[PDB]
C-alpha cells in the first residue's frame, strides 16, 4: 500500500495507490546416485554365504 | 526328508535388499536434510478373491496374443 503527498496549484489531485502483485513458486530437484555390485547383491542377501 | 548335505538344498528346496532398502529410506523419517544440534461355492469365490490377494501382493517368459477368426 503505498504513500501520497498533499500538492498545490493546477494539478491532477492524487490518490492513492495499492498494487496487488503475485509471484508463483518455481521447481527444482536434486540428484544423487549410488551404486552396487553383482558381488555385493549376492553378499548383502544370502546368496554367496 | 532332509540331506547330509544341508547347503545345497537350503537354497534347491526354495529380496533382503529390498527389506535392507526400505529400511535405511522408508524407516527413516524426515529425510533429508539436517538440522544443527457354501461349502464349494463359498470355497471358489473366497479363492478367487483371494487370488486377487496374492497375485495384488506381488508385481518376462510368456506372451499371449489372442485374436477371433472363422474355421
Known sequence: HQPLIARDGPHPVEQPVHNYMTKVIDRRALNAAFSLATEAIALLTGEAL | ?71
Open chain 2, 1 to 71: 526328508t532332509k540331506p547330509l548335505p544341508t547347503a545345497p538344498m537350503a537354497w534347491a528346496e526354495s529380496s533382503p535388499r529390498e527389506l535392507a532398502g526400505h529400511a535405511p529410506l522408508r524407516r527413516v523419517l524426515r529425510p533429508p536434510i539436517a538440522r544443527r544440534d457354501t461349502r464349494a461355492t463359498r470355497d471358489d469365490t473366497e479363492q478367487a478373491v483371494d487370488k486377487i490377494l496374492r497375485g495384488a501382493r506381488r508385481a518376462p517368459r510368456y506372451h499371449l496374443t489372442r485374436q477371433v477368426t472363422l474355421t
